[PDB]
Design a protein around this ligand. Structure first.
Ligand SMILES: *[C@@H]1O[C@H](CO)[C@@H](O[C@@H]2O[C@H](CO)[C@@H](O[C@@H]3O[C@H](CO[C@H]4O[C@H](CO[C@H]5O[C@H](CO)[C@@H](O)[C@H](O)[C@@H]5O)[C@@H](O)[C@H](O[C@H]5O[C@H](CO)[C@@H](O)[C@H](O)[C@@H]5O)[C@@H]4O)[C@@H](O)[C@H](O[C@H]4O[C@H](CO)[C@@H](O)[C@H](O)[C@@H]4O[C@H]4O[C@H](CO)[C@@H](O)[C@H](O)[C@@H]4O[C@H]4O[C@H](CO)[C@@H](O)[C@H](O)[C@@H]4O)[C@@H]3O)[C@H](O)[C@H]2NC(C)=O)[C@H](O)[C@H]1NC(C)=O
Ligand SMILES: *[C@@H]1O[C@H](CO)[C@@H](O[C@@H]2O[C@H](CO)[C@@H](O[C@@H]3O[C@H](CO[C@H]4O[C@H](CO[C@H]5O[C@H](CO)[C@@H](O)[C@H](O)[C@@H]5O)[C@@H](O)[C@H](O[C@H]5O[C@H](CO)[C@@H](O)[C@H](O)[C@@H]5O)[C@@H]4O)[C@@H](O)[C@H](O[C@H]4O[C@H](CO)[C@@H](O)[C@H](O)[C@@H]4O[C@H]4O[C@H](CO)[C@@H](O)[C@H](O)[C@@H]4O[C@H]4O[C@H](CO)[C@@H](O)[C@H](O)[C@@H]4O)[C@@H]3O)[C@H](O)[C@H]2NC(C)=O)[C@H](O)[C@H]1NC(C)=O
Ligand SMILES: *[C@@H]1O[C@H](CO)[C@@H](O[C@@H]2O[C@H](CO)[C@@H](O[C@@H]3O[C@H](CO[C@H]4O[C@H](CO[C@H]5O[C@H](CO)[C@@H](O)[C@H](O)[C@@H]5O)[C@@H](O)[C@H](O[C@H]5O[C@H](CO)[C@@H](O)[C@H](O)[C@@H]5O)[C@@H]4O)[C@@H](O)[C@H](O[C@H]4O[C@H](CO)[C@@H](O)[C@H](O)[C@@H]4O[C@H]4O[C@H](CO)[C@@H](O)[C@H](O)[C@@H]4O[C@H]4O[C@H](CO)[C@@H](O)[C@H](O)[C@@H]4O)[C@@H]3O)[C@H](O)[C@H]2NC(C)=O)[C@H](O)[C@H]1NC(C)=O
Ligand SMILES: *[C@@H]1O[C@H](CO)[C@@H](O[C@@H]2O[C@H](CO)[C@@H](O[C@@H]3O[C@H](CO[C@H]4O[C@H](CO[C@H]5O[C@H](CO)[C@@H](O)[C@H](O)[C@@H]5O)[C@@H](O)[C@H](O[C@H]5O[C@H](CO)[C@@H](O)[C@H](O)[C@@H]5O)[C@@H]4O)[C@@H](O)[C@H](O[C@H]4O[C@H](CO)[C@@H](O)[C@H](O)[C@@H]4O[C@H]4O[C@H](CO)[C@@H](O)[C@H](O)[C@@H]4O[C@H]4O[C@H](CO)[C@@H](O)[C@H](O)[C@@H]4O)[C@@H]3O)[C@H](O)[C@H]2NC(C)=O)[C@H](O)[C@H]1NC(C)=O
Ligand SMILES: CO[C@@H]([C@@H]1OC(C(=O)O)=C[C@H](NC(=N)N)[C@H]1NC(C)=O)[C@H](O)CO
Ligand SMILES: CO[C@@H]([C@@H]1OC(C(=O)O)=C[C@H](NC(=N)N)[C@H]1NC(C)=O)[C@H](O)CO
Ligand SMILES: CO[C@@H]([C@@H]1OC(C(=O)O)=C[C@H](NC(=N)N)[C@H]1NC(C)=O)[C@H](O)CO
Ligand SMILES: [Ca+2]
Ligand SMILES: [Ca+2]
Ligand SMILES: [Ca+2]
Ligand SMILES: [Ca+2]
Lengths: 388, 388, 388, 388
């Protein structure tokens, strides 16, 4: 086996096709399905799998009560076969904790989990299913990371972490790992003013991460990483097509180097593919809550502060609950280009559906097509009343 | 590994022996068995597996309510080990959608799933467990395909699709795939007037598909495909032994090039093995409903419009519910001939058994023997009353 | 891989040690454990597994009602990992039917299942998980076979079948298979007057089978098979230590060439290891019913009509229900001898425990030691009251 | 494959990081999780797994009633994937019995289980999943062994056994196995006065075991084994930091060659890493009961009868139930040193929580870091009230 190199460009994105869907909440009404949240997708050279943070209980289990909670000792990063639900019997534990990332470098997989109390959390870096390196909290305020896959080039796998305030300046670091060992880290540079939950993908240009500004911005910060030089830059998506949630209405001029104002101290993990005229942005349909999901083709969104959509695709109707979303690609697929993919977390239960005492989710996932495919919409599909 | 070539003839069929049976509905009364329909069987070079369209819920789950429905977002093609039931914990998702086919070419498996609304459906073609090609609806009216396995020769795997009316002329296409890529497609030619749900098998003569005419015919249309030239012909089974359901009583003269009249706008997926004096036809015993199943040896059924049975075998008693049936063979078995096999879907629940609110099925499967074996009958075996 | 040859003698048997136990009925009180009966054990070159005939329902499932029944369409030979219980999710179906045998030849496994009505049953012979040969009933009266493993030498695997009366002369045949194909069969010869459910093992001397005479005998018939010449002889165990059930009390003179009288038209599957001074016989402790199990060292039991025990070991107390028992060995273990092993079926439910409506079992298994080990007793361990 | 040699020293232990946690009792409230106790962890060259003694029933099963019991016929050593819970469907049975050890030698795994009545117990030694050797009780009083992993060097795997009184002088033996065969055994020598449940680890210095004195001592006995010479010595941890439970308060002078007095006829399995200035001891926080767990850095604890802690880490709060603890390491990890690891059994149910009728546990596990990591605490996390 050899380390994977990012040698291809993105395939032309003309629409999105269904890739995976687990119907976890439907099935979990009567099966031993683990309560999860913060899911993602990540590929090995021979298999692609679903990932999420378990809550250490099934949905029907009485311990599902209180699972709106973010950071218990009962959480772990688990993975399971593509489009199956996360069950007690099919889920593989990657590491223990309440914030994670994971990626395959072509030879083996690195997984990182953070655990601990708010003022004393630590990351453990696993490589080829063994713990290799550990990182202590540097700001003593909820050390946290991507909640979707990292990306590797020639064995080097950059990861974005943040430690510090969720509502003011924080201490963000980019770490560069190889075989689970720390090669280097650096403090965030550039014009992004707050960074959380980066969604990343790689292509010949380098590694691109679209993150969330939880503090003041409703445009998304972007970190661009060179995995060879092990350096990065940051800014915001310039486009006035705003993609955080909640968010103001779309103006006609966006902001490249500062948060677009209107909504403070909140946000949702999201993603984009920034590729000149082949640029597509994901966002919730609602500007107020985590409901609906759509993709919008916004040429040069990264650099053009006047850019608007010229094409789109609804993924989840506004009437249906969405949640976190993030990027991944099958770096080991055949062909001359990397096919852009993404997942959407479909959150069920609390806080929006409070007749149940749990919070969980299912997953839907799409990849790009060079065809102009007809669109459907993809709800979680569970009926809350059945759980009462 | 090499691509499989269709180098053998069919084994002489003198009777049928039990091959597989999953008892899924019996077991699912108290186990996490997924609700399915439209099942089939398909072999890899090292394993044969059961396939079906899941409904994204177990039978005992409250979401089983309403599963008579054909095309939800919660359906997926799943596969699972031969004669095991389709459980949450043992089922592998091949792709997402509500109409499917799948086949191994000797090197890897191609699976195709169609999803979408009626007017905007699309096929995604997967090869070696990755999405490779996509096909948009061409008639905007329920793009649909075989619901049983396709067949490959030297890497070329033909698949029959239909888009358009179920009750009038429609747009049927034969696609030719290799490694999931589209080599060619062509519009239906020949005398078949309506084509749905083709059941196919291969042998040195080429690929033979027995389909369903949903519009006017109660004889079955046949498509014969040359996978090297990538061309086909079509007609009907000439025999007056009629094999659709519902259907008129058997006359003494059949129809080779037009639908045999009497029953309109309905039908069931079925199959035959058309091999001169070694010809066997499957059909429901009832002419009115999907109940019973029998095999009948009808020499030269394809070409002889006077042909009648000379031997037969009951598979399912008329007192028991049947359903879809289709062909498959183990192309990788030892020996000098291909052993003909088939499955019968045993539908339980709605619409025929409406005291439950679900629709599901189990599977029984047979292969041919050169012996003249004694016959049994093979019911689903579940007691509906237990589910109340 | 090479075919296994029977090149070793039996290890000296000085006691028996615990080998496996699945506690299936205990666990099945609250888990998806399949109802079974007629279990056995059989080894591959890399793994040993438990085998049994499923009834196509779990114990807690409502379809467990009526499982005292021997021969439904819902039965199948399943296998599962050593000492695990037979669950819906871990059981591999080998073939469909209600009477079976199975054995590995060193390269692949042959499994045989018989299915059908009483007057029209048939065997299907599977090799390397594919159907290869079929055998129709020859006497039209419940074609039936060993219900424990067969044994192979240089690719030749003999199997004993019986078709015909259970209460008078029947038609017993010994078949010789290689790669699932029929090399030869022959009618029973020798002095055994009725043969059912042979338990077999192999060693340099050939293949030895201890069977059951269901008609008149309470001593056990023995068939000795030469797998090279493909010939056999038969007689009874000469010893007055009688080992069928039910049975008369032990006399002082046994019978070598005729049934020992007293009990007609009943019996239980059993086994022995016949090895001169290293001979050990298994039997139920009760002479009236299937309760208890003990091993007795009876020198030259096969040939000495006065032979009595000189050592023994209780396996199951008389207070606890037993059932079928049979022989197997790990032919692929290291060392200079084959270690004798056996299983005992521990039947729970009907007819003896009729407060439940089901019949099932668990398994306990022992192998021999050259040590003189202390003895325990090994009950099924389930409490019937829990199932009410 | 080659036998592993103990060529490395221990990594410097500056703190402990989370390694694994199964949340078994939480999950088992609504899933088919087996009741266990006496768990441990052990690595193969390609995977690390959790181990424990099953009770042959799930927690929700009615047979969980009475599982405080130590030695039934329904117990077995099982293993299952790291941090998954021990379920009916994912647990692999290693051998049958109620006292165990297991270890991989670099080529294959040896597992040992003891079963039998108190006066007639016996060990069966399994190697590469086959029974190889057996050892009869020598003192006829509950033959028993480590309840955590053994350690191997160049194919030789020492194991400590005890047979005889729990409350007076007993007969302890050290056995030396290779490929499951007995090379040698010897009677305990040295100054340790009573030995049970040794927790062992290996490094270039040899094999170090920290055991329990059940008779008079609240300091822990230590056995140091040379796996090449196949000889050993014994004494006690000299440190006045006492680590058994229950135990007296810590004095200022410990005892090197005799039990430290105050508590008789009780104890708990525990462990330490004895490595000069890199020495760390584990213990319950409570001196009265199995509650809490902490690690304490006690330089030269083995040899210094005045030694006190200079650093520590809380693992489980005193408010939470703990239980057995033991050592293991991944001998096949990359790097220049062996990373010390340990598990803590978190016992739930009887005798401390008697509103339920069962006794079970979950597992938490840590390994060492060269960083000074922030500490969390790791409770079982189940709510007993949910089980009522
Ligand atoms: C079968 O399936 C197919 C395939 O999926 C279906 O076809 C798809 O249909 C959907 C739905 O219509 C389309 O999505 C929309 O796309 C438009 C963009 O395309 C339009 O505009 C293009 C740009 O035009 C401008 O520039 C060009 C320069 O060339 C210039 O020519 C033009 O004059 C103008 O200046 C046009 O080029 C384009 O035309 C082309 O395509 C047509 C087909 O679509 C075709 O007929 C033409 O011939 C030509 O080829 C077309 O006119 C997106 O604008 C739109 O997204 C907006 O609207 C949705 C609601 O529908 C909303 O959710 C989005 O967020 C967005 O609107 C919000 O944001 C805007 C930007 O800030 C803002 O301006 C809006 O006011 C709005 O903002 C408000 O809401 C948001 C969200 O809550 C909030 O945040 C804000 O604050 C505020 O409150 C859709 O994405 C697909 O593109 C189309 N696909 C294809 C391949 O055709 C087909 O319908 C299905 N068939 C059936 C029968 O069902
Ligand atoms: C143990 O197991 C074994 C193995 O399974 C069992 O043996 C099997 O027994 C079954 C049941 O009998 C047989 O199936 C039937 O086969 C017959 C065909 O064979 C008969 O006819 C042959 C043809 O004869 C004609 O041509 C020859 C030319 O050679 C000429 O000689 C003759 O005069 C005549 O002109 C004969 O050759 C054949 O004889 C041979 O075999 C005999 C044994 O079967 C043997 O004894 C002889 O010596 C000789 O060797 C034999 O006579 C099928 O016709 C029949 O199928 C029809 O009937 C069933 C109901 O039973 C029905 O469901 C079928 O659909 C079909 O009838 C419908 O369709 C017809 C065609 O259109 C129509 O004409 C009918 O009116 C009817 O139509 C109505 O119903 C349908 C369905 O609902 C509806 O759609 C219509 O609209 C309409 O309403 C059976 O398949 C097996 O072949 C046989 N197997 C073997 C190897 O023997 C054995 O019984 C078991 N033992 C025990 C104790 O249980
Ligand atoms: C810790 O574990 C160890 C290891 O397991 C335990 O030790 C074991 O203890 C058990 C139980 O006692 C033993 O099993 C019994 O073995 C005897 C056979 O051994 C005895 O007889 C031998 C033969 O003696 C004859 O020939 C010799 C020639 O050398 C001659 O010297 C002698 O005079 C006589 O002529 C003796 O050699 C042997 O002595 C040796 O071993 C002794 C230890 O056992 C030792 O102390 C001596 O020093 C010497 O070394 C010994 O005396 C079996 O006969 C017996 O089986 C019968 O009884 C059981 C009930 O207990 C019954 O279930 C059996 O079916 C059988 O009895 C039935 O069948 C008979 C034959 O037809 C019949 O005659 C009986 O009347 C009876 O028939 C009735 O019941 C059956 C069944 O329902 C029914 O079908 C009939 O119709 C009828 O109704 C046991 O198998 C183990 O051998 C022994 N193992 C070892 C290694 O020691 C130890 O106890 C445990 N410790 C503790 C504290 O628990
Ligand atoms: C974020 O996470 C980090 C990392 O985990 C947290 O930092 C950790 O904090 C914990 C809790 O405080 C520390 O654990 C304790 O460690 C001390 C040992 O360190 C102290 O003592 C050292 C030795 O000093 C002596 O020798 C030196 C020689 O150099 C000499 O200088 C000195 O004068 C004295 O003579 C000091 O070196 C050390 O200082 C160093 O570290 C400091 C930080 O800790 C730092 O600030 C300094 O600058 C310097 O660098 C420090 O003073 C353990 O003693 C202690 O364990 C005892 O207490 C706990 C309860 O807390 C108890 O459970 C233990 O069993 C034990 O006490 C029992 O046993 C004793 C021995 O017999 C006995 O004397 C006690 O009376 C007591 O006995 C009673 O209870 C037991 C148990 O029930 C019973 O059996 C008996 O019978 C009896 O009833 C803790 O382990 C970590 O070391 C520390 N880690 C690090 C890297 O800093 C941080 O707090 C977190 N942040 C936040 C905000 O939460
Ligand atoms: C604390 O809230 C953070 C994250 O919030 C989100 C969410 O659904 O909004 C869930 C994450 N939950 C988990 N990863 N478990 C939180 N992140 C953490 C570390 O709690 C937020 O981005 C502000 O810093
Ligand atoms: C019919 O009874 C036969 C077998 O009886 C036994 C039993 O528990 O006694 C179960 C077998 N059940 C199964 N193998 N399924 C039967 N054997 C058969 C073929 O029914 C008997 O040996 C007489 O011929
Ligand atoms: C009998 O008690 C012994 C062991 O006690 C412990 C315990 O939780 O205290 C459980 C073990 N349970 C199991 N290993 N099953 C016992 N050990 C045995 C062999 O029962 C003790 O160390 C005195 O000899
Ligand atoms: Ca924001
Ligand atoms: Ca029709
Ligand atoms: Ca008898
Ligand atoms: Ca003690």
């Amino acid at each position: 086996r050899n380390f994977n190199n990012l040698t291809k460009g993105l395939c032309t994105i003309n629409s999105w096709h269904i890739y995976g869907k687990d119907n976890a909440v439907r099935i979990g009404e009567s099966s031993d399905v683990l309560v999860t949240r913060e899911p993602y997708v990540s590929c090995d050279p021979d298999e692609c799998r679903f990932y999420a943070l378990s809550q250490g209980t099934t949905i029907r289990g009485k311990h599902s009560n209180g699972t709106i909670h973010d950071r218990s000792q009962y959480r772990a990063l688990i993975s399971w076969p593509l489009s199956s639900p996360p069950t007690v019997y099919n889920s593989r534990v990657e590491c223990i904790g309440w914030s994670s990332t994971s990626c395959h470098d072509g030879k083996s997989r690195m997984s990182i989990c953070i655990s601990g109390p708010n003022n004393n959390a630590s990351a453990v870096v696993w490589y080829n299913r063994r713990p290799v390196a550990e990182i202590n909290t540097w700001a003593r305020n909820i050390l946290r990371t991507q909640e979707s896959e990292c990306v590797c080039h020639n064995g080097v796998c950059p990861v974005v972490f943040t430690d510090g305030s969720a509502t003011g300046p924080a201490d963000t670091r980019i770490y560069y790992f190889k075989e689970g060992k720390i090669l280097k880290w650096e403090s965030l540079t550039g014009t992004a003013k707050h960074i959380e939950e980066c969604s990343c993908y790689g292509e010949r240009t380098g590694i691109t991460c679209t993150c969330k500004d939880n503090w003041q911005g409703s445009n998304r910060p972007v970190i661009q990483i060179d995995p060879v030089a092990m350096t990065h830059t940051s800014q915001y998506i310039c486009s006035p097509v705003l993609t955080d949630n909640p968010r103001p209405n779309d103006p006609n001029i966006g902001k490249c180097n500062d948060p677009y104002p209107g909504n403070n101290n909140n946000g949702v993990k999201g993603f984009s593919y920034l590729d000149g005229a082949n640029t597509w942005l994901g966002r919730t349909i609602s500007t107020a809550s985590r409901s609906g999901y759509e993709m919008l083709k916004v040429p040069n969104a990264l650099t053009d502060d006047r850019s608007k959509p010229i094409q789109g695709q609804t993924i989840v109707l506004n009437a249906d609950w969405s949640g976190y979303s993030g990027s991944f690609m099958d770096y080991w697929a055949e062909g001359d280009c990397y096919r852009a993919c993404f997942y959407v977390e479909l959150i069920r239960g609390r806080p929006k559906e409070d007749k149940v005492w749990w919070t969980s989710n299912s997953i839907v996932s799409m990849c790009s097509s060079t065809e102009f495919l007809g669109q459907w919409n993809w709800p979680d599909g569970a009926k809350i009343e059945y759980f009462l």
